[PDB]
């Protein structure tokens, strides 16, 4: 419950930041560019923290089993239950990665290791380039 | 016109921003080339080293030259005034006009 509690508080503050950026964008007059950058960076790094913390506690979330309350009436709130129950993605993202995979399209494994060696080589090359010139 | 010193100062500054533009352009080409390098054709691999080296050497010496300019600012300290003579020069030209008026052989 502790992990889900931390997820709750962090997601609540993320939703609060979203409500903020919403009600300062809803104005008919656009504020200064710099305030928009500050709000963007803060909210976006907060989203990063959301992702990282959700990553950290996957085991606690998975272990939990969902069950409706005995006191909760489904006869009158079945629509509300179904609203939270549904999880299928929005369609546009679906065909989005479908076209993405269409465009992308032992052989695969050796290309994978070739990518490994290119990555390592590029990292070493840029380390050497940084070391070549004194930046301090 | 301005004294020459300001002229080469502004030339050096213009060179500075042109070098910055060249650095941005070379960043564009290196970002371009890395894409196909990730794609998997090794022909343009040698060009990558040259592009990276030229990009870094363009980034460094530009900042170095700008640092030299800001340093020049440090020792350049200590190194209507025209109005004080302005009326005088006006005076001069007016009398010149009188001369042109005074001589009828020069009014042609």
Q: Could you tell me if A18 and A43 are in contact, meaning their C-beta atoms sit under 8 angstroms apart?
A: yes
Nearest to A129 among B37, B38, B56 (CB): B56
State the smallest CA–CA distance between residue A131 and chain B in angstroms.
11
Tokens found for residue B49 = 């080293």
Q: Could you tell me if B69 and B9 are in contact, meaning their C-beta atoms sit under 8 angstroms apart?
A: yes
CA-to-CA distance for A36 and A21, rounded, in angstroms?
8
Q: Could you tell me if A53 and A7 are in contact, meaning their C-beta atoms sit under 8 angstroms apart?
A: yes
Angle B59-B61-B63 (CA atoms, 0-180°, nearest 5)?
70
- The SS3 of residue A135 is coil
Q: Could you tell me if B27 and B83 are in contact, meaning their C-beta atoms sit under 8 angstroms apart?
A: no
Q: Could you tell me if B50 and B32 are in contact, meaning their C-beta atoms sit under 8 angstroms apart?
A: no
Pick from B27, B76, B83: nearest CA to B55: B27
Tokens found for residue A58 = 């996957």
State the smallest CA–CA distance between residue A22 and chain B in angstroms.
34
Tokens found for residue A110 = 């050796």
Q: Please tell me if residue B60 touches chain A, with a CB cutoff of 8 Å.
A: yes
Tokens found for residue B10 = 């502004």
CB contact under 8 A, B57 and A133: yes
How many C-beta atoms lie closer than 10 Å to residue B46's C-beta?
9
């Amino acid at each position: 419950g502790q992990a889900l509690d931390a997820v709750r508080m962090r997601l609540a503050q993320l939703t609060h930041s979203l409500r903020r950026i919403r009600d300062e964008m809803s104005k008919a007059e656009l504020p200064q560019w710099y305030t928009l950058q500050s709000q963007l960076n803060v909210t976006l790094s907060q989203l990063v923290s959301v992702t990282s913390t959700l990553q950290h506690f996957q085991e606690t979330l998975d272990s939990t089993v969902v069950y409706p309350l005995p006191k909760f009436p489904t006869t009158s709130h079945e629509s509300l239950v179904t609203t939270l129950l549904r999880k299928k993605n929005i369609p546009e993202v679906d065909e989005w990665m479908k076209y993405v995979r269409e465009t992308s399209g032992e052989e695969i494994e050796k290309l994978l290791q070739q990518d490994r060696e290119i990555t390592n080589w590029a990292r070493t090359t840029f380390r050497n380039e940084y070391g070549k010139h004194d930046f301090k | 016109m301005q004294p020459p010193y300001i002229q080469e100062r502004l030339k050096s500054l213009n060179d500075i921003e042109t070098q910055l533009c060249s650095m941005l352009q070379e960043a564009s080409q290196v970002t371009f080339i890395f894409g196909e390098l990730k794609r998997g054709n090794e022909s343009v691999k040698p060009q990558f080293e040259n592009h990276v080296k030229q990009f870094y050497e363009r980034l460094d010496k530009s900042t170095t030259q700008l640092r030299k300019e800001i340093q020049l600012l440090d020792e350049n300290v200590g190194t209507n005034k025209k109005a004080l003579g302005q009326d005088t020069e006006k005076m001069e030209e007016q009398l010149d006009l009188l001369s042109a008026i005074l001589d009828p052989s020069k009014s042609k």
